[PDB]
Design a protein around this nucleic acid. Structure first.
Lengths: 129, 81
DNA sequence: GATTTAGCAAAACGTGGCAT
DNA sequence: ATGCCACGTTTTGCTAAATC
């Protein structure tokens, strides 16, 4: 009591966002992986959702999507490489996820100059993003 | 003394999952970290092994040993977030 | 050749509640 | 407060295909 800064239910989750961000560049790091960094999937999901506002598994995909998108525009790293690097089983898989998220094919997104920061979830996950 | 050694772990400018997780283990000063056993700290159900690289970097680049007892590290004003 | 796509199935997940 | 099932959902996985 007598703090007016952070919440007890918040501090227990205020060590998951950073964990994911520093573990999504290569590994999958979903609820099951974050289980060793918090609690059981079904419990962590509930706690994460009631803190950040978004779902864990949802957040993982959302952040990875925008991260790859940036590397498709700023960098010229091959789609197949980015896929395998980010934990995707195949380029086809990444193409599916990207298309069902940004609605634009990964290869086209790389050439689309009109496309910018749209549907780009940031490593905050607390205020709409 | 070292300018960053007397700084909060949350404001050491490291990676993502490192500085923020360290201040969640009652560590708000690097002085505690240098006297902390990595074998236990990195085993905490949250701390990542990828953070060890940055943590060890701070100690190594400062000439600090694992669990090196400091004569004086906590000043007058020492609070948490 | 490269990219994108066809479906199918599963896995987890989305949550609610439940249990301790 | 911690653990769990179920229902459902998304994704996933999988073989291929199609387009560029």
């Amino acid at each position: 009591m007598t703090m007016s800064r952070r919440n007890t239910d918040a501090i227990t989750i205020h060590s998951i966002l950073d964990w994911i961000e520093d573990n999504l560049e290569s590994p999958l790091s979903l609820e099951k992986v974050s289980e060793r960094s918090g609690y059981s999937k079904w419990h962590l999901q509930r706690m994460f959702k009631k803190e950040t506002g978004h779902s864990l598994g949802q957040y993982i995909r959302s952040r990875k999507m925008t991260e790859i998108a940036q590397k498709l525009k700023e960098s010229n790293e091959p789609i197949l490489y980015l896929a395998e690097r980010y934990g995707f089983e195949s380029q086809q898989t990444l193409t599916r996820t990207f298309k069902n998220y940004f609605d634009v094919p990964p290869h086209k997104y790389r050439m689309t100059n009109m496309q910018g920061e749209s549907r780009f979830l940031h490593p905050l996950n607390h205020y709409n993003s | 003394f070292d300018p960053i050694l007397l700084r909060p772990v949350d404001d050491l400018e490291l990676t993502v999952r490192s500085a923020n997780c360290l201040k969640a283990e009652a560590i708000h000063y690097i002085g505690d970290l240098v006297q902390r056993t990595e074998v236990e700290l990195l085993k905490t159900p949250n701390l990542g092994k990828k953070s060890l690289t940055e943590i060890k970097d701070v100690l190594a680049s400062r000439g600090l040993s694992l669990g090196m007892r400091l004569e004086n590290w906590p000043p007058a004003s020492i609070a948490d977030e």
